[PDB]
Amino acid sequence: KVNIKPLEDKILVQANEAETTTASGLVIPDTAKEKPQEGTVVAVGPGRWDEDGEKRIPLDVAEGDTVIYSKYGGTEIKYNGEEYLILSARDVLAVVSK
Template sequence: MSKRLIPLLDRVLVEKIVAPTKSVGGILLPETAVSKARNINEGKVLAVGPGRRAGNTAELIPMGVKVGDKVLLPDYGGTEVKLSSKDGAKETFLYTDSEILGIVSDQ
């Protein structure tokens, strides 16, 4: 059974991007190359909450990221969330909008 999580307030559900252990051609990568790639903390935004409230008002402050964004994550932090899917368990974490360091652009 597949679970779905809808974040509340200013929380963001992120799937961490795991460094590949094989090249595109099928060659196993050396441990040094894999460990360097693991130091890059990037993830893909899977779900986003509506935003946080501005003081005691009902007004919501919009989120800085959207679903599908590739984001830079801090070394520590976030709450690990166990979600299963057709592809197996993914490494997913729940962060607040302010914990995300930036949006990674491929341009």
């Protein structure tokens, strides 16, 4: 069991997505980069430094947060047949809560 620690304002997200199944039985993956997804925040970076080496701008997401994000610019990472993505917090569109 490894432990990934995102840098700057990048976060690690666990893809809660599932490929769509065609009626004929074919399964087409979601190569869709523009297609936004819903996942869970697993790790967050410290935050980006401001103009001067003063303070880190806290992120607006935390571990456990369910979020909607864009895959574009993201980096896929698999671990124990698990899908993960490393993306900038600016790609996160919104947080979904119950």
